[PDB]
Design a protein around this nucleic acid. Structure first.
Ligand SMILES: [Mg+2]
Ligand SMILES: [Mg+2]
Ligand SMILES: [Mg+2]
Ligand SMILES: [Mg+2]
Ligand SMILES: [Mg+2]
Ligand SMILES: [Mg+2]
Ligand SMILES: [Mg+2]
Ligand SMILES: [Mg+2]
Ligand SMILES: [Mg+2]
Ligand SMILES: [Mg+2]
Ligand SMILES: [Mg+2]
Ligand SMILES: [Mg+2]
Ligand SMILES: [Mg+2]
Ligand SMILES: [Mg+2]
Ligand SMILES: [Mg+2]
Ligand SMILES: [Mg+2]
Ligand SMILES: [Mg+2]
Ligand SMILES: [Mg+2]
Ligand SMILES: [Mg+2]
Ligand SMILES: [Mg+2]
Ligand SMILES: [Mg+2]
Ligand SMILES: [Mg+2]
Ligand SMILES: [Mg+2]
Ligand SMILES: [Mg+2]
Ligand SMILES: [Mg+2]
Ligand SMILES: [Mg+2]
Ligand SMILES: [Mg+2]
Ligand SMILES: [Mg+2]
Ligand SMILES: [Mg+2]
Ligand SMILES: [Mg+2]
Ligand SMILES: [Mg+2]
Ligand SMILES: [Mg+2]
Ligand SMILES: [Mg+2]
Ligand SMILES: [Mg+2]
Ligand SMILES: [Mg+2]
Ligand SMILES: [Mg+2]
Ligand SMILES: [Mg+2]
Ligand SMILES: [Mg+2]
Ligand SMILES: [Mg+2]
Ligand SMILES: [Mg+2]
Ligand SMILES: [Mg+2]
Ligand SMILES: [Mg+2]
Ligand SMILES: [Mg+2]
Ligand SMILES: [Mg+2]
Ligand SMILES: [Mg+2]
Ligand SMILES: [Mg+2]
Ligand SMILES: [Mg+2]
Ligand SMILES: [Mg+2]
Ligand SMILES: [Mg+2]
Ligand SMILES: [Mg+2]
Ligand SMILES: [Mg+2]
Ligand SMILES: [Mg+2]
Ligand SMILES: [Mg+2]
Ligand SMILES: [Mg+2]
Ligand SMILES: [Mg+2]
Ligand SMILES: [Mg+2]
Ligand SMILES: [Mg+2]
Ligand SMILES: [Mg+2]
Ligand SMILES: [Mg+2]
Ligand SMILES: [Mg+2]
Ligand SMILES: [Mg+2]
Ligand SMILES: [Mg+2]
Ligand SMILES: [Mg+2]
Ligand SMILES: [Mg+2]
Ligand SMILES: [Mg+2]
Ligand SMILES: [Mg+2]
Ligand SMILES: [Mg+2]
Ligand SMILES: [Mg+2]
Ligand SMILES: [Mg+2]
Ligand SMILES: [Mg+2]
Ligand SMILES: [Mg+2]
Ligand SMILES: [Mg+2]
Ligand SMILES: [Mg+2]
Ligand SMILES: [Mg+2]
Ligand SMILES: [Mg+2]
Ligand SMILES: [Mg+2]
Ligand SMILES: [Mg+2]
Ligand SMILES: [Mg+2]
Ligand SMILES: [Mg+2]
Ligand SMILES: [Mg+2]
Ligand SMILES: [Mg+2]
Ligand SMILES: [Mg+2]
Ligand SMILES: [Mg+2]
Ligand SMILES: [Mg+2]
Ligand SMILES: [Mg+2]
Ligand SMILES: [Mg+2]
Ligand SMILES: [Mg+2]
Ligand SMILES: [Mg+2]
Ligand SMILES: [Mg+2]
Ligand SMILES: [Mg+2]
Ligand SMILES: [Mg+2]
Ligand SMILES: [Mg+2]
Ligand SMILES: [Mg+2]
Ligand SMILES: [Mg+2]
Ligand SMILES: [Mg+2]
Ligand SMILES: [Mg+2]
Ligand SMILES: [Mg+2]
Ligand SMILES: [Mg+2]
Ligand SMILES: [Mg+2]
Ligand SMILES: [Mg+2]
Ligand SMILES: [Mg+2]
Ligand SMILES: [Mg+2]
Ligand SMILES: [Mg+2]
Ligand SMILES: [Mg+2]
Ligand SMILES: [Mg+2]
Ligand SMILES: [Mg+2]
Ligand SMILES: [Mg+2]
Ligand SMILES: [Mg+2]
Ligand SMILES: [Mg+2]
Ligand SMILES: [Mg+2]
Ligand SMILES: [Mg+2]
Ligand SMILES: [Mg+2]
Ligand SMILES: [Mg+2]
Ligand SMILES: [Mg+2]
Ligand SMILES: [Mg+2]
Ligand SMILES: [Mg+2]
Ligand SMILES: [Mg+2]
Ligand SMILES: [Mg+2]
Ligand SMILES: [Mg+2]
Ligand SMILES: [Mg+2]
Ligand SMILES: [Mg+2]
Ligand SMILES: [Mg+2]
Ligand SMILES: [Mg+2]
Ligand SMILES: [Mg+2]
Ligand SMILES: [Mg+2]
Ligand SMILES: [Mg+2]
Ligand SMILES: [Mg+2]
Ligand SMILES: [Mg+2]
Ligand SMILES: [Mg+2]
Ligand SMILES: [Mg+2]
Ligand SMILES: [Mg+2]
Ligand SMILES: [Mg+2]
Ligand SMILES: [Mg+2]
Ligand SMILES: [Mg+2]
Ligand SMILES: [Mg+2]
Ligand SMILES: [Mg+2]
Ligand SMILES: [Mg+2]
Ligand SMILES: [Mg+2]
Ligand SMILES: [Mg+2]
Ligand SMILES: [Mg+2]
Ligand SMILES: [Mg+2]
Ligand SMILES: [Mg+2]
Ligand SMILES: [Mg+2]
Ligand SMILES: [Mg+2]
Ligand SMILES: [Mg+2]
Ligand SMILES: [Mg+2]
Ligand SMILES: [Mg+2]
Ligand SMILES: [Mg+2]
Ligand SMILES: [Mg+2]
Ligand SMILES: [Mg+2]
Ligand SMILES: [Mg+2]
Ligand SMILES: [Mg+2]
Ligand SMILES: [Mg+2]
Ligand SMILES: [Mg+2]
Ligand SMILES: [Mg+2]
Ligand SMILES: [Mg+2]
Ligand SMILES: [Mg+2]
Ligand SMILES: [Mg+2]
Ligand SMILES: [Mg+2]
Ligand SMILES: [Mg+2]
Ligand SMILES: [Mg+2]
Ligand SMILES: [Mg+2]
Ligand SMILES: [Mg+2]
Ligand SMILES: [Mg+2]
Ligand SMILES: [Mg+2]
Ligand SMILES: [Mg+2]
Ligand SMILES: [Mg+2]
Ligand SMILES: [Mg+2]
Ligand SMILES: [Mg+2]
Ligand SMILES: [Mg+2]
Ligand SMILES: [Mg+2]
Ligand SMILES: [Mg+2]
Ligand SMILES: [Mg+2]
Ligand SMILES: [Mg+2]
Ligand SMILES: [Mg+2]
Ligand SMILES: [Mg+2]
Ligand SMILES: [Mg+2]
Ligand SMILES: [Mg+2]
Ligand SMILES: [Mg+2]
Ligand SMILES: [Mg+2]
Ligand SMILES: [Mg+2]
Ligand SMILES: [Mg+2]
Ligand SMILES: [Mg+2]
Ligand SMILES: [Mg+2]
Ligand SMILES: [Mg+2]
Ligand SMILES: [Mg+2]
Ligand SMILES: [Mg+2]
Ligand SMILES: [Mg+2]
Ligand SMILES: [Mg+2]
Ligand SMILES: [Mg+2]
Ligand SMILES: [Mg+2]
Ligand SMILES: [Mg+2]
Ligand SMILES: [Mg+2]
Ligand SMILES: [Mg+2]
Ligand SMILES: [Mg+2]
Ligand SMILES: [Mg+2]
Ligand SMILES: [Mg+2]
Ligand SMILES: [Mg+2]
Ligand SMILES: [Mg+2]
Ligand SMILES: [Mg+2]
Ligand SMILES: [Mg+2]
Ligand SMILES: [Mg+2]
Ligand SMILES: [Mg+2]
Ligand SMILES: [Mg+2]
Ligand SMILES: [Mg+2]
Ligand SMILES: [Mg+2]
Ligand SMILES: [Mg+2]
Ligand SMILES: [Mg+2]
Ligand SMILES: [Mg+2]
Ligand SMILES: [Mg+2]
Ligand SMILES: [Mg+2]
Ligand SMILES: [Mg+2]
Ligand SMILES: [Mg+2]
Ligand SMILES: [Mg+2]
Ligand SMILES: [Mg+2]
Ligand SMILES: [Mg+2]
Ligand SMILES: [Mg+2]
Ligand SMILES: [Mg+2]
Lengths: 77, 139, 141, 110, 203
RNA sequence: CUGACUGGGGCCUGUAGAGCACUGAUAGGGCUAGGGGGCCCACCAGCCUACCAAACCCUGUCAAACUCCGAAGGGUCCCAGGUGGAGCCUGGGAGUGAGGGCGCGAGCGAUAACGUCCGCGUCCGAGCGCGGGAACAACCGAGACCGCCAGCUAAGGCCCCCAAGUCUGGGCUAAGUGGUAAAGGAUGUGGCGCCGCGAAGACAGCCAGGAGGUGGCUUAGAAGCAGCCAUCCUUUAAAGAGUGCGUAAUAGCUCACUGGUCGAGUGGCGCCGCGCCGAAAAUGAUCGGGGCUUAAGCCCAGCGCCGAAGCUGCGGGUCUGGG
RNA sequence: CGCCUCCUAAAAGGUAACGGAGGCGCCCAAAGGUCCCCUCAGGCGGGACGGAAAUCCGCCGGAGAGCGCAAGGGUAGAAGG
RNA sequence: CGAUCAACGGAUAAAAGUUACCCCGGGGAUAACAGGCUGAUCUCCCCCGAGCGUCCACAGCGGCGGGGAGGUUUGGCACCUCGAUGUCGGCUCGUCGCAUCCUGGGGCUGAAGAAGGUCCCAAGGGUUGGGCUGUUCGCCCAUUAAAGCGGCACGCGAGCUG
RNA sequence: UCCCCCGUGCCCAUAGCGGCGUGGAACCACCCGUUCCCAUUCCGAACACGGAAGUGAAACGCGCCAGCGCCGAUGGUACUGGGCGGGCGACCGCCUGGGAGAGUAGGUCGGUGCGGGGGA
């Protein structure tokens, strides 16, 4: 008797890294995700792995637009 | 293999193994009470690995001893019907000279070899079937 | 006997037996029901023994409804192995049953017949049971 | 159930909106052509121009070019200089192109 | 025919205290009103076992009012198998959707042949006026063989009552009975072991 | 002053629960491909279904790797309270990298282990110091600086051993249950609540009858106790074409049943209490013991007391802080 | 025995067992960049060879297809053609 | 650019076995004996009453399932013991349990009698000699009122045997 | 600031499906053409241009309808942060604070910002 299992991959520690109302600097990663669980909003870029980051200094704001998806914004200071 | 007819005997094995052979029993020794076959093993160390082979060989003799008594019954029966007297003996003789199909059981002789040794004959067995009722019926 | 025709996964974690039933707590088909009074994994062996107990009492006639289904695989390691080396093999299937579930239902049968058949079937199960008859409370569900 | 026309419209506009520039939207009917310069950040139209409002007349292409020049003139009066062209569902060609070219001749920046 | 049940108003009393006092908490409502009420448990049980959700229950309120209601929802304690809450739907002159008992008149010929009449619906959902509530709806099941079925389309409806379910909805069936003669084949019936649905490069 | 913890506010989440919209599972109907068995046929069409049975639909359900839903909580930021053997920053010195029990959440295991592996917490570890639990690291009480022949309490207790009530009010249990266990069984016993049956006199005893057609698929000769198919009716109570002795022939006793009697309630559910059986292991027994029965047991409601190294009182030591 | 996906994981992250299941050790000169254009699976009906399913026509259709390969997330207001 | 340094943070550029001829340093951090916890397996007892028993569910039986008891089996765990807890069987000596083999008492019997079956009570005493085999166990011979089953570190090697 | 239409945004089905009705003066659409610009792996279907004889049939706009879809209380419960208890356990209760989902009543054939053209 033996196992044909026993494998698993390293945890990737995905998710939001900066919540609404938090003071960020340009470049701060805001969301780590697989695909677009959140979409880039105003002053928010998205990297080749769907990572959202701040484009400007400011304050993070989230917005749920229904069928248009959830968006992450940065409001300049 | 149903359990109501099995008395299982456990105890200590016999031979090499050290203090484990001395202490742990582990020698299964079954006894099939109706048939009498006793197959008894000590090969693997656990009595449950020993239980397996003990059960798996009782069947090989419960089946062997029944298949014998049934094929011993298949040769005692067949030897009588065919009869070693296959030179000339029991049932019928078929004349191809004069066509006398005869059955020596009763007597009835006829010329229906053309109609019998070239087709069916369900009606010429009837006297052999009818004379065999009055054989049993009248006595 | 009862077991899934197919499944996505062969083996299933054991889980828990907290609380009263999620559903199935009211009579829904027959005239009388057998309700579970305490939680258990009910084996397909136990289910079928209860069923056979009822049809063999009715002798001919009536209708039995089995409202629990054993879809949960039961696992057991071979005799005399040690801990480890993976999960044991599937030896059977059980239906998770919690207090308040209607397990069996009968119809087309006199009251005394229904009372007696469900009683004998209760003796085939590993839990305390209660016999109930259809109510307005049941119809209102 | 969307149509190719609505999908093509969303496609080109979403890309325009993303740059954050003021957008020069152009609607083209069988008879007329209309243009409004829009601040999508407030959802407000800033300056307007159309053949229907200018009573323009002849060849559709030359007409469009003129509504383009007109939109430019009125835009610069408001300090609007940089803009992004919203061709919407239309290929950049013919009448739409003419309007764009007319807007450029007026000093509108794109 | 028509039943009466004394009800009382409640405010901040805890539902647990009420039920420990023998009082069944409840609510009474319609598009115009919504009031928290409670009724005596044993009194309500005497009424409800007869009335069910089919017959009118007028609630004799302590302020002198008397409102005609239908029981619209009864929440059961899943463990103890006892009611813990009632919804009383206050009736008014408008037509109302409700459930009307089915009376299965006749003995099906399939039943005479040994079968069993499975009473799929014991009532039917119906739009009707409160002044117009029938007591039952008769259904002639004597023609049903093993195994024939009746549907809501076969319902003869009285005047002023309108079917509120699809006429395709089946309402009764006559099924074959349980038989010991089948036990032998069922016990010797071998089952194929369950197949596992493939994952990965198998699917 | 930034800490643990706490208050408000914003946001992030997919667990408990629940649900079946998806992935599958799923019983029973309906509806209906496909086959199966049966008809009529091969002229290729044509009919049956209580066989199996896709989809679809209805009722009813299941799921760690299913979610149309979805908490309590948790995380994080902002403003506040919070001066603590708190927090940050830089350096010097370590020890540890075998843990364990308990509560909760899971996996593994067998819904076994003083088992095993994680999560949250806790205690032992290092509190084998103190009070309770008969004794007992981790259960309950409680963090021991020293002294006191002073006081208040904690758990637990207050009949004697053994400090404090043989205290007070109302019940329950006769099993020493308490003072060692399950399915399941049982007119033990005690409560409530709610239906039946009850004046042309009941349940139980005595009394008088208790029949007549009298055979059937019908036979191993038994109309009625032989296996079924039987359940019509009548001699102006109206008494089974039959429950216990003779029967491959009959007696005769008997009930259900009817009347006559003598002179007052009876049965059924459901929730709760406390007890009974089920209950057999190895040196001599025992709830710690002795002993306990309107208790010295159990439930409820009370006042009082005893009780520690906890708290107070009083005196002292030392460190830190404030004068 | 390293790497990936899902679960166990107790709604942030992380979290073990010889716990439950699958994959990787490549691939593409386009299967990449940018412009433009286009929308799927499936179901019903129609239709020569021609069928359950080639291609053609029509209606129904929010995504259940596709996205090179495991799984998950994501996705037609494209990331697919 | 040369890595199945894939034991994938990769000890050398370069490496397999055996020891019962064995040795040291350690560990009850870790197995084998016994104990312990557990009771899957084992033994025994119940629950249900399908059906058997000419008739008759329960004289005697008890389909499929259900709940326990025990701590004699084989295991699971790794808790005291590896600066040592000597292991099978035999002999000697016992002692205890009772789920009783005999004897004593009793209920039911498909108990005529005699002899049986089964269940209740009951542990006072008794429970043979041989053949085989190291055997426990088991088979067999000749008897018997009977030729019980288990606990005690599978009792007992500072008592012996080996 | 009112009504209709044409653009373009916001809320993200209370906005959708279906059915019916309605509108061409204006706008929009089909529509007429395929010379020109541009275009079809074939096709002026689409894309595109030049047009204004016709039609609101399609499409679109605007109404009405609750068969479907969508939304959905109030009660009560599950579950639970913290605090306690009970059971040999599988598990069950109490206090305090929070509080679903399903279902029921019901709600819905959209609301609104900007700029145009027209109308009073
Ligand atoms: Mg393997
Ligand atoms: Mg694994
Ligand atoms: Mg790996
Ligand atoms: Mg990791
Ligand atoms: Mg991991
Ligand atoms: Mg992972
Ligand atoms: Mg996140
Ligand atoms: Mg990329
Ligand atoms: Mg990029
Ligand atoms: Mg906001
Ligand atoms: Mg913003
Ligand atoms: Mg030997
Ligand atoms: Mg050795
Ligand atoms: Mg051993
Ligand atoms: Mg588990
Ligand atoms: Mg089980
Ligand atoms: Mg298991
Ligand atoms: Mg092993
Ligand atoms: Mg082991
Ligand atoms: Mg394992
Ligand atoms: Mg297993
Ligand atoms: Mg099983
Ligand atoms: Mg259940
Ligand atoms: Mg039971
Ligand atoms: Mg429901
Ligand atoms: Mg066009
Ligand atoms: Mg501060
Ligand atoms: Mg802070
Ligand atoms: Mg803080
Ligand atoms: Mg806070
Ligand atoms: Mg759940
Ligand atoms: Mg589903
Ligand atoms: Mg449903
Ligand atoms: Mg579950
Ligand atoms: Mg579930
Ligand atoms: Mg999950
Ligand atoms: Mg889930
Ligand atoms: Mg919701
Ligand atoms: Mg929250
Ligand atoms: Mg928080
Ligand atoms: Mg917060
Ligand atoms: Mg502060
Ligand atoms: Mg400190
Ligand atoms: Mg510190
Ligand atoms: Mg300081
Ligand atoms: Mg130092
Ligand atoms: Mg130093
Ligand atoms: Mg260390
Ligand atoms: Mg360790
Ligand atoms: Mg370690
Ligand atoms: Mg640990
Ligand atoms: Mg711990
Ligand atoms: Mg301990
Ligand atoms: Mg624990
Ligand atoms: Mg746990
Ligand atoms: Mg787990
Ligand atoms: Mg078990
Ligand atoms: Mg442990
Ligand atoms: Mg444990
Ligand atoms: Mg555990
Ligand atoms: Mg560890
Ligand atoms: Mg230590
Ligand atoms: Mg302590
Ligand atoms: Mg400590
Ligand atoms: Mg200690
Ligand atoms: Mg103590
Ligand atoms: Mg003490
Ligand atoms: Mg202790
Ligand atoms: Mg202590
Ligand atoms: Mg201590
Ligand atoms: Mg201290
Ligand atoms: Mg005091
Ligand atoms: Mg006290
Ligand atoms: Mg005491
Ligand atoms: Mg005293
Ligand atoms: Mg007293
Ligand atoms: Mg007793
Ligand atoms: Mg006692
Ligand atoms: Mg006792
Ligand atoms: Mg009981
Ligand atoms: Mg009991
Ligand atoms: Mg009783
Ligand atoms: Mg009682
Ligand atoms: Mg008969
Ligand atoms: Mg007892
Ligand atoms: Mg008293
Ligand atoms: Mg004291
Ligand atoms: Mg003191
Ligand atoms: Mg002190
Ligand atoms: Mg002092
Ligand atoms: Mg001091
Ligand atoms: Mg100090
Ligand atoms: Mg995780
Ligand atoms: Mg997780
Ligand atoms: Mg997580
Ligand atoms: Mg968490
Ligand atoms: Mg992190
Ligand atoms: Mg692999
Ligand atoms: Mg390209
Ligand atoms: Mg298609
Ligand atoms: Mg076709
Ligand atoms: Mg064809
Ligand atoms: Mg075709
Ligand atoms: Mg897809
Ligand atoms: Mg693949
Ligand atoms: Mg190299
Ligand atoms: Mg490999
Ligand atoms: Mg390595
Ligand atoms: Mg290497
Ligand atoms: Mg590598
Ligand atoms: Mg390594
Ligand atoms: Mg690594
Ligand atoms: Mg290395
Ligand atoms: Mg190196
Ligand atoms: Mg090297
Ligand atoms: Mg080299
Ligand atoms: Mg080497
Ligand atoms: Mg090497
Ligand atoms: Mg060597
Ligand atoms: Mg050698
Ligand atoms: Mg050798
Ligand atoms: Mg030598
Ligand atoms: Mg030597
Ligand atoms: Mg040698
Ligand atoms: Mg040597
Ligand atoms: Mg050594
Ligand atoms: Mg060394
Ligand atoms: Mg050494
Ligand atoms: Mg050890
Ligand atoms: Mg180790
Ligand atoms: Mg060991
Ligand atoms: Mg060992
Ligand atoms: Mg050892
Ligand atoms: Mg061992
Ligand atoms: Mg051992
Ligand atoms: Mg030993
Ligand atoms: Mg020991
Ligand atoms: Mg011992
Ligand atoms: Mg033990
Ligand atoms: Mg046991
Ligand atoms: Mg046990
Ligand atoms: Mg035990
Ligand atoms: Mg067992
Ligand atoms: Mg028992
Ligand atoms: Mg019995
Ligand atoms: Mg029989
Ligand atoms: Mg009998
Ligand atoms: Mg029978
Ligand atoms: Mg029995
Ligand atoms: Mg059996
Ligand atoms: Mg069991
Ligand atoms: Mg033992
Ligand atoms: Mg033992
Ligand atoms: Mg072991
Ligand atoms: Mg053991
Ligand atoms: Mg050990
Ligand atoms: Mg150890
Ligand atoms: Mg350990
Ligand atoms: Mg040792
Ligand atoms: Mg020594
Ligand atoms: Mg020593
Ligand atoms: Mg020594
Ligand atoms: Mg020694
Ligand atoms: Mg005895
Ligand atoms: Mg005797
Ligand atoms: Mg005797
Ligand atoms: Mg006798
Ligand atoms: Mg005799
Ligand atoms: Mg006897
Ligand atoms: Mg007896
Ligand atoms: Mg007895
Ligand atoms: Mg004795
Ligand atoms: Mg003795
Ligand atoms: Mg003895
Ligand atoms: Mg002997
Ligand atoms: Mg000998
Ligand atoms: Mg021997
Ligand atoms: Mg010898
Ligand atoms: Mg032997
Ligand atoms: Mg032999
Ligand atoms: Mg003798
Ligand atoms: Mg004798
Ligand atoms: Mg002995
Ligand atoms: Mg042993
Ligand atoms: Mg022994
Ligand atoms: Mg020994
Ligand atoms: Mg011995
Ligand atoms: Mg010895
Ligand atoms: Mg020895
Ligand atoms: Mg000794
Ligand atoms: Mg010694
Ligand atoms: Mg000695
Ligand atoms: Mg010694
Ligand atoms: Mg010797
Ligand atoms: Mg030797
Ligand atoms: Mg508009
Ligand atoms: Mg019109
Ligand atoms: Mg229209
Ligand atoms: Mg017009
Ligand atoms: Mg006109
Ligand atoms: Mg041309
Ligand atoms: Mg030209
Ligand atoms: Mg024209
Ligand atoms: Mg129209
Ligand atoms: Mg359009
Ligand atoms: Mg709702
Ligand atoms: Mg609510
Ligand atoms: Mg809690
Ligand atoms: Mg628990
Ligand atoms: Mg609460
Ligand atoms: Mg609350
Ligand atoms: Mg919820
Ligand atoms: Mg809700
Ligand atoms: Mg609507
Ligand atoms: Mg519409
Ligand atoms: Mg709008
Ligand atoms: Mg706006
Ligand atoms: Mg205007």
């Amino acid at each position: 008797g033996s196992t044909r299992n026993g494998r698993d991959s390293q945890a990737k520690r995905l998710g939001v890294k900066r919540y609404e109302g938090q003071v960020v600097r340009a470049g701060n990663i805001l969301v780590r995700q697989r695909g677009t669980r959140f979409k880039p909003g105003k002053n928010v870029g998205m990297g080749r792995d769907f990572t959202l980051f701040a484009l400007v200094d400011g304050v993070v704001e989230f917005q749920d637009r229904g069928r248009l998806g959830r968006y992450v914004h940065v409001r300049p200071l | 293999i149903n359990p109501a007819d099995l008395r299982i005997d456990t105890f200590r094995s016999s031979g090499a193994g050290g203090q484990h052979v001395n202490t742990t029993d582990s020698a299964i020794r079954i006894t099939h009470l109706p048939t009498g076959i006793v197959v008894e093993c000590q090969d693997e160390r656990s009595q449950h690995k020993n239980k397996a082979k003990a059960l798996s060989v009782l069947g090989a003799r419960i089946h062997a001893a029944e298949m014998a008594k049934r094929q011993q019954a298949e040769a005692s029966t067949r030897r009588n019907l065919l009869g070693s007297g296959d030179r000339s003996d029991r049932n019928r003789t078929y004349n191809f000279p004069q066509g006398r199909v005869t059955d020596h059981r009763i007597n009835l002789t006829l010329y229906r070899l053309d109609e019998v040794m070239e087709g069916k004959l369900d009606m010429l067995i009837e006297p052999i079937i009818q004379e065999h009722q009055a054989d049993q019926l009248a006595a | 006997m009862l077991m899934p025709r197919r499944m996505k996964y062969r083996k299933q974690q054991r889980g828990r037996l907290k609380g009263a039933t999620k559903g199935g707590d009211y009579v829904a088909f027959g005239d009388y029901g057998l309700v579970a009074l305490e939680p258990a994994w009910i084996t397909a062996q136990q289910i079928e023994a209860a069923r056979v107990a009822m049809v063999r009492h009715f002798r001919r006639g009536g209708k039995i409804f089995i409202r629990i289904f054993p879809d949960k695989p039961y696992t057991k390691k071979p005799l005399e192995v040690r801990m480890g080396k993976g999960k044991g093999n599937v030896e059977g299937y059980v239906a998770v049953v919690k207090p308040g579930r209607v397990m069996f239902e009968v119809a087309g049968v006199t009251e005394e017949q229904a009372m007696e058949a469900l009683r004998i079937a209760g003796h085939k199960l590993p839990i305390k049971t209660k016999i109930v008859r259809r109510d307005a409370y049941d119809e209102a569900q | 159930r969307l149509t190719a026309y609505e999908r093509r419209k969303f496609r080109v506009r979403n890309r325009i909106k993303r740059t954050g520039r003021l957008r020069l939207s152009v609607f083209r009917s069988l008879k007329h052509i209309y243009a409004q310069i829009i601040d999508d950040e407030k959802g407000v139209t800033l300056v307007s121009a159309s053949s229907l409002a200018l009573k323009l007349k002849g060849n559709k292409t030359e007409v469009a070019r003129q509504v383009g020049r007109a939109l430019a003139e009125k835009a610069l009066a408001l300090g609007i200089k940089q803009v992004a062209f919203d061709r919407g569902p239309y290929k950049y060609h013919g009448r739409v192109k003419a309007l764009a070219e007319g807007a450029r001749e007026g000093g509108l920046e794109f | 025919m028509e039943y009466r049940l004394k009800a009382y108003y409640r405010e901040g009393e805890k539902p647990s205290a009420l039920r420990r006092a023998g009082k069944l908490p409840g609510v009474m409502y319609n598009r115009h009103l919504n009031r928290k009420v409670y009724v005596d448990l044993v009194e309500f049980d005497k009424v409800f076992r007869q009335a069910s959700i089919h017959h009118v229950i007028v609630l004799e309120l302590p302020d002198g009012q008397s409102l005609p209601t239908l029981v619209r929802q009864v929440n059961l304690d899943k463990r103890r198998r006892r009611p813990e809450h009632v919804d009383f739907f206050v009736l008014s002159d408008e037509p109302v959707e409700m459930y009307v008992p089915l009376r299965f008149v006749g003995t099906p010929a399939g039943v005479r042949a040994g079968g069993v009449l499975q009473e799929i619906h014991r009532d039917i959902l119906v739009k009707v006026s409160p002044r117009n509530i029938p007591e039952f709806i008769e259904v002639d099941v004597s023609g049903l063989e093993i195994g024939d079925s009746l549907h809501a389309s076969d319902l003869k409806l009285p005047p002023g009552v309108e079917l509120a379910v699809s006429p395709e909805e089946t309402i009764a069936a006559v099924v074959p009975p349980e038989d010991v003669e089948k036990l032998a084949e069922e016990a010797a019936a071998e089952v194929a072991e369950p197949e596992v649905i493939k994952k990965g490069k198998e699917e």
